Amino acid sequence: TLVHVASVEKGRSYEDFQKVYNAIALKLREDDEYDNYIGYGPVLVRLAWHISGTWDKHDNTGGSYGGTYRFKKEFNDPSNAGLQNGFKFLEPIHKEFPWISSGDLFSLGGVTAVQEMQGPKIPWRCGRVDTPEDTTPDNGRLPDADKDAGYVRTFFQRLNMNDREVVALMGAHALGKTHLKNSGYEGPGGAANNVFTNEFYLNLLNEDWKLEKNDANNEQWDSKSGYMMLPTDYSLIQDPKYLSIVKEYANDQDKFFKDFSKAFEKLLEDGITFPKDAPSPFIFKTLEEQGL
Template identity: 40%
Template sequence: MSTEVSTDKYNAVRQDIIKAFPKEDYDDGSFAPVVLRLAWHASGTYDKNHKDGGSDGATMRFKAEAEDSANAGLEVARGVLEPIKAKHQWITYADLWTLAGCVAIEHMGGPHIPWAGGRRDKNNEMDCPPIGRLPDGALGKDHVIDVFITRMGFTVQETVALIGAHTVGRCHRDRSGFEGPWTETPTRFSNQFYKQLLTQTWTEKKWDGPRQFEDEDGDLMMLPTDMALLEEPFRPYVELYAKDKQKFFEDFAAAFLKLIELGVNRRARL
């Protein structure tokens, strides 16, 4: 297949992705948040030292990676995109999943991400990255630094910007063990996550579940890794993004593009 696929073809895929998002009886009425999470988890396995993992290859198609407990629930997102893959067979899963994440962000009112295609699908389960690379929400600041800065190669600022994606979506008890949304507008991409983080009084939820935090009403939640952003060296960027939505959008767009490009080698033979 030629790599010279016309922009029109991508536009047709974009339109079909947008059409697949609304679903009245699912969560908050949209698959967009879970599709965004798929793009992140497909990419967030990258290791800059081993130079493996990342979105190129779409290895989450294979059981080993699909069954990583961190990926619980992402079969929903892959399922939503499957008919689009069937209709536009020329696009690779690796391109479709990352493109769909970008379309989800924009569809929810977030910034445009200048996505580029050219990823290929790996066809061997042996190519799956090691299980356990994705972050564990129950841990703290050192873990966030290990995963985002040491392993993936992001800066402190990029790390804070990326985790701001928790402005959309929610946790599901039967997927991660955590429960609830981060904001009152879980299908609207904004800087609400940082505002909530700074202005609510967060206390540990008393329940028979993993350690998480809740606001005074018990409606909103934060993971321990989200709370870690209130500490140095992250906190100044939380304060910046809470005040300046435009700056958040610009930094998020750049960091998300970097995330979905990690390990993408358009010349390599797969």
Template identity: 45%
Template sequence: MSPHHDYDAVRKDIAALLHMPDYDDGSAGPVFVRLAWHSSGTYDAETDTGGSNGAGMRYEAEGGDPANAGLQYGRAFLEPIKKKYPWITYSDLWTLAGVVAIKEMGGPDIPWQGGRTDLVDDSKVPPRGRLPDGAQGADHLRFIFYRMGFNDQEIVALTGGHNLGRCHGDRSGFEGPWVTNPTRFSNSFFKLLLQLDWQPRKMRSGNTQFVYVDPDAEEGEEPLMMLPTDMALASDPAFAPWVHRYAEDKELFFDHFSKVFAKLIELGIQRDAQGNVTNTDGSLGGYVSAPKKSDTPTGPPRARL
């Protein structure tokens, strides 16, 4: 990682990019958070494969995973920044975009260091199936997150990212936002999960989600939703205490979320005493920045989450 790399300038340009009136709820922030999350959540601690280093989503083997449907928009939104700063790696750009988006949407500061390299080919792209399936329950969550090295408390804290964004029926088979303000980071997800009367609803996709229909809602107003994995947090004996604590204490949630998101985006990253990444790829090694890709979003039509 060279000292001339101006990450602060990149941060400012990412922040300026967030406001998008014609996309979802008017912000690219939630899709940037999901991009950082999914690019990191492929890590397997036992084999030390996957994770944010490499930006494997540039290749069909990972980018085409149905779990990543919709993320082609987030990747394409960031292409003007890649063009302006061709030295930055995609793996740094995607993780930094998530960190900046969380802060700009009212969330906590999240420690971030640059220096990730981009894969030079798809030989190290992790296999599909490592990301969460929202249609499952507590056992599935543990299977996915324990593989990465997270514990029960960290699983609940990370799921608090559902304070942001929404599901899309044409991507995941689920539909709607979790909270009333999906572009503002808060602990509302946990409060609503515990306070509202969630009723199962079968979707056209065949999935079952849980919805709350406000009796005082105006005609055509979109109901809030929860995934089966969300509901599992409130009923599981080990997960539920953390749901209650985060619903009651926003500062505690922000503190724990900051720590666990920082851990997520560093999974598999090896650094020396100066903080320089020592992971390499192929024969090139060092800080390898992949060439800029297309500004046009292309990707899988469906996703699990």
């Protein structure tokens, strides 16, 4: 019912946002030690997802538009524990480019992270506008990890995502790790990765998974190679419809990249009305492509 119309930051164009992208990317390169040398890429992807994943298609509450993660109710959501690291990373970027909206910054952080981690290009649109503290969605809109495929499927209908979009998005769980103090899940340690590939799907299909209890007394799936999956991750191979799609992405890197790009852009744009004369989506060059 609420309408959020994208409004381009005054006078700004592609080159302005490429500069912001570049600053994020240069800081990703510089701050390499974070989380035992994983770096900030994975947490920035999770931040972009969590600021977007509060959306409810029924009333257009939540979503990335309003930048409401900057308000304490949302930044203190138990579901967001650990994301303060990503926010702190983005603070000096926002100070350098104070003209960018909070939603644009948080979402751009995720795009930049995916691309700099050698993921697909993610087209990105500007024009999110900060909204007041009373527009902050209540806690409890982000998903639980201890549930089954039916829970996941129903959960993602609220975000207008179908089976293929859900399975594609979940491939982000190749990135980074779980931290017991944040979520009650732990790992991987030495098997953690900061390069974007389709390995989530290959690992689901090819590892010898054991259902174990962690030190927080929660169940998770662990392999002898040191990989781990949440119950919701493992549900993608328990449900026959999800399983077919897992097999598809395990066997086609390009298809996975293309589907993830579309689903991730969609996620980041849910709730936003783009005027018919809005700029086209921007596709930012990586530092590597720029020789930087």
